[PDB]
Amino acid sequence: LEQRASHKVWKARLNAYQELNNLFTKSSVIPNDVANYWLDPELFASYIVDSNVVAQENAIIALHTLLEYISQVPNVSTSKLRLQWIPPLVEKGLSSSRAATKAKATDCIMLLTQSDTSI
Amino acid sequence: RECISIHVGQAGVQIGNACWELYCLEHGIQPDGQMPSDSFNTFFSETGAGKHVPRAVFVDLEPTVIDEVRTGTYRQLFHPEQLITGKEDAANNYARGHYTIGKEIIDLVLDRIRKLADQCTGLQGFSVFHSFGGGTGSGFTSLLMERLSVDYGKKSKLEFSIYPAPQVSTAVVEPYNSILTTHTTLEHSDCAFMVDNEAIYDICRRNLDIERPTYTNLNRLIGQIVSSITASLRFDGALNVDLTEFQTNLVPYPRAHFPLATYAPVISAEQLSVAEITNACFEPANQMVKCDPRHGKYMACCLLYRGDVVPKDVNAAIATIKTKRTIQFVDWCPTGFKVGINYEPPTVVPGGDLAKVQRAVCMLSNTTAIAEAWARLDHKFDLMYAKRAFVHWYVGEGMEEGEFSEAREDMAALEKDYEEVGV
Amino acid sequence: MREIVHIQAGQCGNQIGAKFWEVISDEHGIDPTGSYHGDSDLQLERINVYYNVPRAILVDLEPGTMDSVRSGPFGQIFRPDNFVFGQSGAGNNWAKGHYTEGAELVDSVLDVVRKESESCDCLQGFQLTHSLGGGTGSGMGTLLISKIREEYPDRIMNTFSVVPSPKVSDTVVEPYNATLSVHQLVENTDETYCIDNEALYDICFRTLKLTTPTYGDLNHLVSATMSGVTTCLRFPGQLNADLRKLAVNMVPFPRLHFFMPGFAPLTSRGSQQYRALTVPELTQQMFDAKNMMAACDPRHGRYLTVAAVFRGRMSMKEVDEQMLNVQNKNSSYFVEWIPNNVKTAVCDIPPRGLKMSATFIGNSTAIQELFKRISEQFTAMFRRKAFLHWYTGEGMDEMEFTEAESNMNDLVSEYQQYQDATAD
Ligand SMILES: Nc1nc2c(ncn2[C@@H]2O[C@H](COP(=O)(O)OP(=O)(O)OP(=O)(O)O)[C@@H](O)[C@H]2O)c(=O)[nH]1
Ligand SMILES: Nc1nc2c(ncn2[C@@H]2O[C@H](COP(=O)(O)OP(=O)(O)O)[C@@H](O)[C@H]2O)c(=O)[nH]1
Ligand SMILES: [Mg+2]
Ligand SMILES: [Mg+2]
Structure with a gap:
């Protein structure tokens, strides 16, 4: 199930992040109530700090495609998101030594920056 | 004071x-x-x-x-x-x-x-x-x-x-x-x-x-x-x-x-004359910086005697060296050796390998031959900086790499400054 | 710059690690109960460096190793909290040590590292012993190093990494593991002593005439080398006193910090050494490649920097003369563009069982020979793609192998560049 995104074993979390990344490509622009990674943004704030470098990077690219699937209406709730998300993104995504873990974290911040009215 | x-x-x-x-x-x-x-x-x-x-x-x-x-x-x-x-x-x-x-x-x-x-x-x-x-x-x-x-x-x-x-x-x-x-x-x-x-x-x-x-x-x-x-x-x-x-x-x-500071005499703990010690001030073996003043021009020269010294012995030893050696000076300098005397004896440490001497002298002389010492450092510097060796240590502790070059140019400029005075 | 935190990881890590603690506990006059029964102040002058009881953390995924240490001679002295051990073993899988199983445990280790660092007047840096062909010592060690590097960036990282050789284990995945680990060490550690099992076997077999060397036999050579290179650190002395100063005078280019250690005289396990060597004899165990702990010929490359440590009562005048001699009589082997690159230091307290000794730490470009051997074995294995499903299954990407392969080859090229460099 989806609740396996917080499962103990890493390779089962790694699935859920890929499963999610599909969801945000393949699900509805209008958006299923199953797309509730807005009104609890603590979820992905947790996922970005995964405690596994490979399953972390996969959570960030799921957050990334989520965070561009949200350029559809109405998502005025991007204020809450920047508060919850970019501190984890900066603290441990930009920080990362991993080439791709960093590159997608910056891209994520970009997408949160243009969610906002200004910088 | x-x-x-x-x-x-x-x-x-x-x-x-x-x-x-x-x-x-x-x-x-x-x-x-x-x-x-x-x-x-x-x-x-x-x-x-x-x-x-x-x-x-x-x-x-x-x-x-x-x-x-x-x-x-x-x-x-x-x-x-x-x-x-x-x-x-x-x-x-x-x-x-x-x-x-x-x-x-x-x-x-x-x-x-x-x-x-x-x-x-x-x-x-x-x-x-x-x-x-x-x-x-x-x-x-x-x-x-x-x-x-x-x-x-x-x-x-x-x-x-x-x-x-x-x-x-x-x-x-x-x-x-x-x-x-x-x-x-x-x-x-x-x-x-x-x-x-x-x-x-x-x-x-x-x-x-x-x-x-x-x-x-x-x-x-x-x-x-x-x-x-x-x-x-x-x-x-x-x-x-x-x-x-x-x-x-x-x-x-x-x-x-x-x-350049030159000090005589250095006597082991196991007396000389005023003339003998003043000749040793123009012997390279007793300099504090290894160079050859014979290859350079003097800009100034002071003699600081201390101990059992007769002011006339000094003037004799000076005239001896001013006549019987060829200490080249620059033309725009007072060609006279400045002197001062302090009649108290050179103290040594109880136990020291250095012996108590009756009199002693320390000659301070701004010779252009001390440029030789800068040349030895500058050369060693050049070899390592040619490969940027050990430079990452410095640059990684808040230092711009440029500062190396700016310093080296200031040392090259100083070597030219010593040359132009002595020609 | 006073205290050093010590870490040992994996089987080899805790083996040569404990052996090291055995050696320098004696040298400093500490018994297995942890009490001073020495007779000299030059022994407790800098005991605060490695001791408080050792400032040592013991790590392994293999839980058995716990007991192999405590059931050893000085096994009683180590702090019980500083033992941090997993349930299963890594099984020669670097990915398991670096990404999966070793990563799960690494937090527990950092908690103890923090604890020991917390109560240090002024930390110098860290000291890790481990093997590179393993899964735990290499994979979790390198992951531990990076994790410390980022938590303690104001400190030195100093490793005693031992290189795998077919002469000591026929496991063919070791080239993978060691290549991946070298890709880490070149980026993550300030100085690394390259202990080559190839050279340890060749010394026990050919010089010491032991037909079947055991680990204990190879570990004897290592523990004696370690006490030798750490002599400056553990006793009062002007030159190469602390870890940073050492690295400052040893490492001219950040990536080229892989030292070829070697020392003399080479003794067997508890054999009798009636005839004590002379100063010129010791000095002539430097270029003597049969004394190098790494399987490299200093004749085939050039020394960038050298540190010599003479232990025992002897003529400081003669040592200076012999070192000044051997340098200029082989002037083509020491790099010209680093003047006064060889540095010598003397310690009056000799090692155990010897009247005189001399250890020879060298940043020699010949070390490229060592990295050549590892890479060719790696490439032979990697071109047929053998055993890759082990590593990839644990979350690794095939790309990583290519990057580590290329990065080690850049490291070899760099050594070759400075070997062919000229002062002109
Ligand atoms: N003549 C003389 N030279 C000294 C003495 N102490 C150090 N040196 C020289 O000074 C040079 C630098 O050593 P130190 O002055 O001790 O270095 P430091 O000023 O303490 O700086 P750091 O130790 O790097 O923090 C060396 O080349 C020494 O040969 C001394 O007591 N007398
Ligand atoms: N010198 C030495 N090398 C060892 C020892 N034990 C294992 N090795 C080497 O280390 C490699 C195996 O890694 P090991 O440390 O046993 O695996 P780990 O426990 O997962 O770190 C092989 O190259 C062995 O030759 C030892 O006691 N001494
Ligand atoms: Mg093991
Ligand atoms: Mg100092």
Whole structure:
């Protein structure tokens, strides 16, 4: 199930992040109530700090495609998101030594920056 | 009237000990600070309880050396607030001494200097003791000298640098550190006495008859020669009675302010004439910096005799050397040798390998042959900087790589400045 | 710059690690109960460096290793909290040590590292012992290093990494593991002593005439080398005193910090050494490639920097002469563009069982020979793609192998560049 995104074993979390990344490509622009990674943004704030470098990077690219699937209406709730998300993104995504873990974290911040009215 | 001494890095600190050991014997001052007996209060202050305290600051970015000061023979002599220590040393890196570690302690050090300057009424300036190759000695000093040129800008500052020598060298990068401090300390120093540790090594092997000298051996010899230069300030002689006169007599060019010091006689503890010792001042074997003054022009020359000396013997020995040797001078100089005498005998340390001599002399002469010493450093520097070797250490501790080149150009320009004077 | 935190990881890590603690406990006069029964101040002058009881953390995924240490001679002295051990083993899988199983445990280790660092007057840096062909010592060690590097960036990282050789284990995945680990060490450690099992076997077999060397036999050579290179750190002395100063005078280019250690005289396990060597004899165990702990010929490259440590009562005059001699009589082998690149230091306290000894730490470009051997074995294995499903299954990407392969080859090229460099 989806609740396996917080499962103990890493390779089962790694699935859920890929499963999610599909969801945000393949699900509805209008958006299923199953797309509730807005009104609890603590979820992905947790996922970005995964405690596994490979399953972390996969959570960030799921957050990334989520965070561009949200350029559809109405998502005025991007204020809450920047508060919850970019501190984890900066603290441990930009920080990362991993080439791709960093590159997608910056891209994520970009997408949160243009969610906002200004910088 | 007062002069403040500063000691930076192990070199400064440990030579400091040797000098203040020797100052207290010359002034009959006790290890506890007392005195059963003015001109000497240029260097010492006085407690209400009849105790004589040095006007000195000890600085090291690491306890070990200064810890031995304040648990040793002269632990009582210094106030504990004068002895300042950090925890992480500079690790033979000018960058850490100047930028990374030095900024963490510079303000405490400048503050403790203000406390000694506040006790003083007519402060003259600063004497500064430090190594070249050391990270603390190079980096922190050059920083401290910059900041003293602000907080005390309108007064003198004198250097006592320890020129590096492979025989006691602790680091590969000592040429780097030497060049880097000499660049940034050039504008902020009025006069600077270099001490080649190789010459001091050579002298101790030949004239003191020691196989493998220790630092104590070298520091004692050095402290004897430092005492000879500061004797004029501590006993009220006729020559070099205050810090300005050092620049007046020895510095006819702000940049070229690096005198060669020559000291005779160095007699093992196992008497000579006035003429014999004055000839030894023009013998390279007894110089503090290894070069050949015969290959260079003299800009000035002072003779500081001390002991059983007849002023007429001096004038004979001078005329002997002025006639029977060819000491080339520059045409725009007073062709006359300045002299001063202090009739007190050269004090040695009880136990010292150096013997008590009846008379002694220390010749301070701003010859252009000392450029040879800068050339040796500059060359070693060039070899390593050609491959950017060890440069990442410096750049990774807050230093721009450009500063290497800016320093090297300032050393190349100084080598040209020595050349144009001597042609 | 006072205290050093020590770490040992994996089987080899705790083996040569404990052996090291055995050696320097004796040298400093500490018994297995942790009490001073020495007779000299030069022994407790800098005991605060490695001791408080050792400042040592013991790590392994293999839980058995726990007991192999405590059931050893000085096994009682180590702090019980500083044992941090997993349930299963890594099984020669670097990915399991670096990404999966070793990563799960690494937090527990950092908690103890923090604890020991917390109560240090002034930390110098760290010291890790480990093997590179393993899964735990290499994979979790390198992951531990990076994790410390980022938590303690103001400190030195110093490793005693031992290189795998077919002469000591026929496991063919070791080239993978060691290549991946070298890709880490070149980026993550300030200085690394390259202990080559190839050279340890060749010394026990050919010089010591032991037909079947055991680990204990190879570990004897290692523990004696370690006490030798750490002599400056553990006793009072002017030169190469602390970890940073050492690295400052040893490492001219950040990536080229792989030292070829070697020492003399080479003794067997508890054999009798009636005839004590002379100073010129010791000095002539430097270029003597049969004394190098790494399987490289110093004749085939050039020394960038050299540190010599002479232990025992002897003529400081003669040592200076012999070192000044051997340098200029082989002037073409020491790089010219680093003047006074060789540095010598003497310690009056000799090692156990010897009247005189001499250890020879060298940044020699010949070390490229060592990295050549590892890479060729790696490439032979990697071109047929053998055993890759082990690593990839644990979350690794095939790309990583290519990057580590290329990065080690850049490291070899760099050594070759400075070997062919000229001062002109
Ligand atoms: N003549 C003389 N030279 C010394 C003495 N102490 C150190 N040196 C020389 O000074 C150079 C640098 O060493 P240090 O002055 O101790 O270095 P430092 O100033 O303490 O700086 P760091 O130790 O790097 O923090 C070396 O080349 C030594 O040969 C001394 O007591 N007398
Ligand atoms: N010198 C030495 N090498 C060892 C020892 N034990 C294992 N090795 C080497 O280390 C490699 C195996 O790694 P190991 O440390 O046993 O695996 P780990 O426990 O997962 O770190 C092989 O190259 C072995 O030759 C030892 O006690 N001494
Ligand atoms: Mg120092
Ligand atoms: Mg094991």
